[PDB]
Every structure is written in C-alpha cells, then in structure tokens.
C-alpha cells in the first residue's frame, strides 16, 4: 500500500518552496540595502549659504 | 524498500531547510527595524541656524 504508485512530491515540492523563500527574501533584502543606502546621513549636514 | 528508502536524510534536510528561512526572516526582519528605527521621529530636530 505504501509501495504502490501513487502523488509524488511532499519533499520534493518542499525544498523547492524553501529556495523560493530564500530567493524572495534576498530580493527584500536587497530592496531594503539599496533605500538604506539611497537614505546616507552622512557628514553633508544642509549646507544653508552664508550671508554676504 | 520501507525501512531502507534512501530518503532519511531528507529528515535532517526539510527541519534544516527551516532554520534557513528562520535565519533569513531574521536577517530580512533586523534590516525592516534597520529601516524602521532610521524612519521614527524623534526629538532631535533639523535645527537651521538662528537668523542674527
């Protein structure tokens, strides 16, 4: 019964569901490193220009 | 051909593959605090200096 021919895959469709996550989760990750980066507060403070 | 499948690692491989995604949801999950944390107000303001 349990030899017999039958629906294949509850591993198989499995691993595959764990790479898709993986994979969309970079995709997040790199979405978030590039506003991250697009956002730098670095040492360029509002240059407001000096009176004359 | 029940006992002996050839598909017991697949037991360390799925439980394993979870802790993949555990692990990139973590990373995923500390980079939105890494956004949320620079989106707050706070009491800090962008002070432009006083008009003499």
């Given at each position: 019964?349990m030899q ?5 895959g509850?591993?198989?469709?499995t ?14 990750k790199r979405?978030?490193?590039n506003?991250?980066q697009r956002?730098m507060?670095?040492?360029?403070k509002?240059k ?5």
């Open positions: 019964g017999h021919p039958g629906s294949a509850g591993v198989y469709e691993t595959q569901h764990f790479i898709d996550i993986k994979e969309h989760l970079h995709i997040v979405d978030i490193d506003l991250v956002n507060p670095s040492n360029e509002p407001c220009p000096e009176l004359p």
